[PDB]
Design a protein around this ligand. Sequence first.
Ligand SMILES: [Zn+2]
Ligand SMILES: [Zn+2]
Ligand SMILES: [Zn+2]
Lengths: 118, 633, 103, 128, 112, 176, 104, 112, 83, 59, 111
Amino acid sequence: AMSIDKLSDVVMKATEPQMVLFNIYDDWLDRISSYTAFSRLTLLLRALKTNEESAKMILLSDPTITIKSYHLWPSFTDEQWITIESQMRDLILTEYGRKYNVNISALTQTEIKDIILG
Amino acid sequence: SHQLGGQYSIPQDLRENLQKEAARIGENEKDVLQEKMETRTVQNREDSYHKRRFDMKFELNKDEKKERTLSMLLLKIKNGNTASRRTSMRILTDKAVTFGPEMIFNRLLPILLDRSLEDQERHLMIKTIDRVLYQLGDLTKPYVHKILVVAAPLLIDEDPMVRSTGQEIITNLSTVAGLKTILTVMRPDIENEDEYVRNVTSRAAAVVAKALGVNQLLPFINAACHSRKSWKARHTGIKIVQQIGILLGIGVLNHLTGLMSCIKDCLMDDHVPVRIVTAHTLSTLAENSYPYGIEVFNVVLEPLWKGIRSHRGKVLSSFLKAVGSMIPLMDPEYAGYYTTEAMRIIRREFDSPDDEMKKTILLVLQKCSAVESITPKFLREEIAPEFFQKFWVRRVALDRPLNKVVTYTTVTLAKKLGCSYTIDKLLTPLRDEAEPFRTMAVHAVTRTVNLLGTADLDERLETRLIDALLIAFQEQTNSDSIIFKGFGAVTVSLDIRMKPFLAPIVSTILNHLKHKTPLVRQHAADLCAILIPVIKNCHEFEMLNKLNIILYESLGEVYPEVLGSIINAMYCITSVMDLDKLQPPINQILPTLTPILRNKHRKVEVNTIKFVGLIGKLAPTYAPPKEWMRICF
Amino acid sequence: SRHQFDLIMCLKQPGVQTGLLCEKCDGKCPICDSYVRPKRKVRVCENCSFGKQAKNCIICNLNVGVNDAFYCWECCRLGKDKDGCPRILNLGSNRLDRHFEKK
Amino acid sequence: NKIQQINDKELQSGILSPHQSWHNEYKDNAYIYIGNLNRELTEGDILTVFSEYGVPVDVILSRDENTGESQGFAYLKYEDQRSTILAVDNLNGFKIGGRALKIDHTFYRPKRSLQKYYEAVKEELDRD
Amino acid sequence: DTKILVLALEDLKDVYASKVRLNASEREELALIEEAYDNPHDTLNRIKKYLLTQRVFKPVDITMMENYQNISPVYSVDPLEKITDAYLDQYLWYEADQRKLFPNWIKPSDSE
Amino acid sequence: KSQYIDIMPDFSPSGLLELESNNKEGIALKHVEPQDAISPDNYMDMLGLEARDRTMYELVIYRKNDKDKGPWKRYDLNGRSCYLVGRELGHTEIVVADIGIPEETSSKQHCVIQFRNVRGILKCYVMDLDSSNGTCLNNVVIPGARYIELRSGDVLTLSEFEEDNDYELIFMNVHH
Amino acid sequence: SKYEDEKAAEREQYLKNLNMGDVQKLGINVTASSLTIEDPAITFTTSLLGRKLYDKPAPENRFAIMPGSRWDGVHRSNGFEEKWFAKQNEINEKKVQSYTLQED
Amino acid sequence: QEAIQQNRRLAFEELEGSWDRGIPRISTLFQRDRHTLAYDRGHRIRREFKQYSLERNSPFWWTNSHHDGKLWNLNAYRTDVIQALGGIETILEHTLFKGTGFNSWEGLFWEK
Amino acid sequence: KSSLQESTFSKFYSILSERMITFHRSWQTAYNETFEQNYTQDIEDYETDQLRILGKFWGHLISYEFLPMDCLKIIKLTEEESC
Amino acid sequence: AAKRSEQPDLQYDSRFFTRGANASAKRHEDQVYDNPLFVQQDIESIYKTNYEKLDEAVN
Amino acid sequence: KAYLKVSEEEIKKFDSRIRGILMASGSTTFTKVAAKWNTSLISLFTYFREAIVATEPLLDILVKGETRIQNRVKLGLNSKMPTRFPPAVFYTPKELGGLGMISASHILIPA
Ligand SMILES: [Zn+2]
Ligand SMILES: [Zn+2]
Ligand SMILES: [Zn+2]
């Protein structure tokens, strides 16, 4: 979580012990159930946990898409999320292949889903 | 010219600028009805090559009534009601004799040369030539030239149904017009300059050869092949030997000595296009012969190698095809020598981008597995890895004529190579993105596993194979049998070993039966009928009753293609499993089927009647007899 | 064939290879075309073997063959068994004419 | 007409875009084998038809060392690859001078013996 | 000719694109339209021939649709005649609009 | 040091690529009509007047030995946007150009008669195709490779000098 | 032997690098108008690798590549490139038609 | 005028803004069958006389959405209603949605 | 904002404000102050389309004097300072 | 000297035509909306892993 | 200025249109009635757009029509209870499994 722009900006500056609310889902719960929202969220954290900078490249590619002043995550449409979940999905696999030096066509499908989900 | 108000639509002069374009651009467009107007006419099936049929050269008041009648009959047959032409065929077959065959053929044959006629209309005309030629029995030479102008171009036609009915004529005409007459008509035709006309009557004179026997026709070929007069007579005189060797199949043989007069001496010609043709006409005589021939092919084996060791180019592709197909009929002493000779050439030619060579490389690999001398270790170490990477490119999987070869070649190499080695290499294509390439790599696995059996596979490939199939199963789009037989030929082999893999598979069946697209609910149920004989061997009767109920609750489906295949899986579970322990149970199943017998279609009626009759055998006592009488009606 | 008159049988000396029938023509005697009471395997000549041709049903010679073909009991009593290769050569008037009309 | 046969099957299935297309097998290749040329067409004229689809950086026409006339094949590298996907696909089977030429993707290996022919060609294509 | 057909036949087919359970007359019509696509040239000759020779036609049925205040009549002609009427209609409008027959003022016109 | 390599490239046009676009069935023809090229009548149909108020154009031939017999031939120029001049002898020759002459000093493609639309005005021109012998207007030599503006009555001779001139070609603005 | 191997590797690299297309190798890729336009002030006032480019309007293309300065200007095509659009438009259309023609 | 004048290429980036604008709806210029529609003339009066020849009302008699393009879009209405009812979750407290046992409501499809 | 999402200018949002500006003088200061916030801060965001909806929206308010016109004082035309 | 083929008037970017322009007009009689409320229906698929790209990206 | 209103004939045509929607046949399935009311309604508001603001009788007839169709569904089951039929049942789009009927009739009507 600390690898996000906003949250680091708040936790670095604040000089007192304090509580701060955020809404992690921005406004995603208009068009998305809590289930799939939590699911995408954990995918956006797992790709930020591992690669970091190269995930943040996937998020911040197009500057035309802007993070609002309220939200954390940049405001996409539904389809842009459907592709970005696939890229953020890809970093976990390419990185896994880099780490254990396993060419990833050697894995069973279950092994892929497990890799993506831990 | 001031306007009142303004412009709100588009400027007025701009529409006409648009509506003029549609006249200019539209006349080149081929509108919907314009398209279907042409598609009807048979010429859209044909390449520029086949178009040459029309380039080919074709050359009282009481009796003026017969001149109409035939032209009326020939009209009724071609364009006529089905009850009309049926009466006008009966009139021809009886009365063909009394009408002048001049009048029939001079009137009948020109139709077949127009550019208009549809395929339905053409086959009704050819069927009249065949029925007329059968009777008269004495036919003059002028028409024998005409008939072959019409009939022979069929032999090159796209589809085999037309190819055969063309062949059916010439074998009838060959007997009618006799041996002496036809061989006079080919002589000026084989010396002809035009290519298409020569390619046509190689195939025509060969059909004549089978009907009358080749010996009667052999001195004709010997005159053409050995002819120093024309170069082209040598060429086409050699093609006549192919379509004699292709038609006569195995039976060439005893004639192979007389034929060899043509081939060898006509091979030495300085003209390469002749050099090349004989190199093919040997590979056909070599294969069609098979084990018996070699004693006649030693004479030709020497000049091939001096042609292989030098000329390269496309002469190398043809000579290797000949030498490649002599191998299996050589003695084990030499056969081991020439392959290890030829396997040097292939290793050098795997990088050849040409098609003509790749078709030759496959033939030799195909025939060099059966040689004892190469070890299966040599293949795995060298030939195998340079095979699967070059011949399994996605550009291969698209065109069928080169797919059937690469899979057959793969399957034969699977006897020397391990079963675990080939299946190991076929996992990259089974998971590939391209559809037509996943289907190719399935045919190679189904075919392989039937030969070798799955006992070879270490546990890891056994798990990776099934993951590759389920994937390649669940992305299929088009409906084809190959995935199901394949996924069903794997299970049958390893069946008791399947048990751990059978839990997650059945979960995806139950997951795809909830999918919206009705194709996916076919393949979900089509893959249950396959797994039942394997599930029972693994002895899950708690896992059949789960499938069975789920197939029962879906038995009121709308889509007939889907409802049919669910009953099919119901019929597989019921016959396999005990009746007494069937979960629904039976007495609740049978009354649900009787209103399904009214479902029209077929997939539902067939698969149901097999299910109902099953219960008549196995459990008659459940439904009361007035229920069986509701079924008998 | 028993009911389709144009088709021409082979009638050559039977070899050692067994004829095959497609799933659709399966269970039929190649002579009388009856589904009942088989007796003897069919045996076809070599010159009906060779390449692609060998696989096709010995009745329609179009579809690919799978099961063996038997002579029915009645065709083995009369002797029509041993006349020759019981294989149909041409595709016949009926099959063609359906084909062109459909397209 | 071998390749032209594929794309019709391929497109019919709606394959659309290179990942699923057989043209993806290459990606690192640019030169295209240009076959069944007529005999009199020279490098400049082969550098007519093929700029429709891209910008050629290189060209080589294959011609006998002695008489110096066309063998009938050439190797033409486009600046941006995807021209290759475009030329192979679109212009294959097309008539020039009565004979329909063939294109296909190729890996091209230079031959020492032509070394000067490279600068002699390059200098012209280096003009632009 | 073929284009004016395409327009006519599509105008006729849009009626049955929606319909669900078809009566017999409908099936008859749809048969005529499908045949009109399968032989455009034949049906053009049929049309033009009817434009010459045929001066006596089949009868025309009437029903009334209720608008609850108005009651309005509705004429159903036979499909064989519907096709020639359609082609003839489309053609006359194409020419008459092409040759500037009707002046500007007449107007449930095409532009607005 | 004798030659770099005996082979070397070309970078020269073959006649095949240019030829296919242009056919005289036998041969290629120079001069693709400029974009404003329009046949006169279709320019006259733009200005919409039935033939009495139209301008017409005929190219009349007078054999330069004797003009007293009147027209040798009369060629109407209102039909096409361009017209080609060449050699049709009658005594074998292939017919290429629109307007042929029985002149043995005239090349197969000699001079071109082109009509254009320049700011709403039809203007016929003439250009030498750089034929072997050259061409003359008003019996004055003309430069090649430009459209020279024809003016009513002017004469077109097929050769650079009077010695070879057997024929006169006259361009006509036609009214009243 | 090692040296030889190295040499071989180098030549392979050279072969591959020569073959690679130029734009990919440098690669890295593949409103304003409105404003700069809808603006009164404006009124007051070609190759990716710099290679020569054509002038007149070219036929449209899948990738939008522009013909080289040397192009004669004749269409030469098998006719495929236009047939890909028809499929491209089709597939893109039946994604819309499928929902809109749905009923119940 | 600009493009014809400088021989440039309309980019679709420029004119995508107005893609849905205009009473003929700019997008109707780029229809697939436009070539065959240029021959359909008198369509307005054909639609207004379908009163007489057909029983079924097609309540849009004033538009052919082939020629004119679709003159309205209510897409936004559907979302704004959905949040006027309290969102998709409170809407689905009133249903069997949980009975089915699906996890998420996002991809539900009703048999058509 | 809900005026700018609407794809074209409408008389609804004009009269909605007109009826509102005349209700109480506290809404006089709400539009006067939000015509400054738009022109200064919030013009930097907008597409060339949504400026066509604003232009007409402050057109009816100024030309009917609801604004009034001295609130247009902030507009300054220079090469140096103008967006 | 070679003759140009005709290009009509302005020409247009290819994305004009391939966009499936007025496709919404082959609407059923009574379908008010032209898009599904949710992409996830129209998308036809979510995540299909590509074994070819990953194998390139890993090595 | 051109002031606009809907003519009284084409108000009566609309009212009679709905009247026909209720007796039409196939009216009883809830979704076909709601779809028919949708199309009719969209034909109106789309043809007369601006004019509808200034006509009272048209608004009154809208309020009658929409309640009459909702009553069609309610009487279709057996209740007029408000508690059973919260507005989500009529107004949720068909993609979430309601009628998706499109309400122009809430408003407030100038008196
Ligand atoms: Zn059979
Ligand atoms: Zn029998
Ligand atoms: Zn036999």
